[PDB]
Amino acid sequence: GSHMFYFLSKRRRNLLRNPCGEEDLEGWSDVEHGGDGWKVEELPGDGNVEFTQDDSVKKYFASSFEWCRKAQVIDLQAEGYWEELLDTTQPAIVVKDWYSGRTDAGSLYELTVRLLSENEDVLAEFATGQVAVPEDGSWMEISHTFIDYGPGVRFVRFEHGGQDSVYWKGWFGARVTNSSVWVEP
Ligand SMILES: [Cl-]
Ligand code: NI
16 A cells, blocks of 8 residues: 555556557557558457457457568656666566457467667567467467566567468458556566
8 A cells, every 4th residue: 555566556557559459550660561561450340259358449450461560669667667666676567469360261470579678688588489370260368477587677669460371462361459568566
């Protein structure tokens, strides 16, 4: 009620802008448009129809027949995570993403998240490599929690992407949405 655990718990919030495409590609950088590029689409066109545990999620980004990628760099200090706190406490940095594909074509997904120093030094890294998206159209979560990452972390670089497995014109690639980065104690 006055301790750091309480405050970090209270200030926990997604630090990624525009996680679902409500603002199109706004807030996303190093946007790479492989094939026909990224396209924001709405939930239930139907199919497998899952997106459970969060009904606020209405849209997703769909990738095409060559890699579509996009990234965001989060300034932890600017969001109020004190340099001293980051350096000695190294509080949990939790990154999550949701991906799915179509039932009429396979697709691939990849996530790379890095903790960077003030000068873009790569201090920590989580990387999925290329991942087979579920054939049945279901949404899959990926989650990684960075701990014990050492001093000097200032930025979180979140990068993800998708492509189809069929090389077809249109948007048959991996779909991504509800991406998150937050700090917890
Ligand atoms: Cl949140
Ligand atoms: Ni307290």
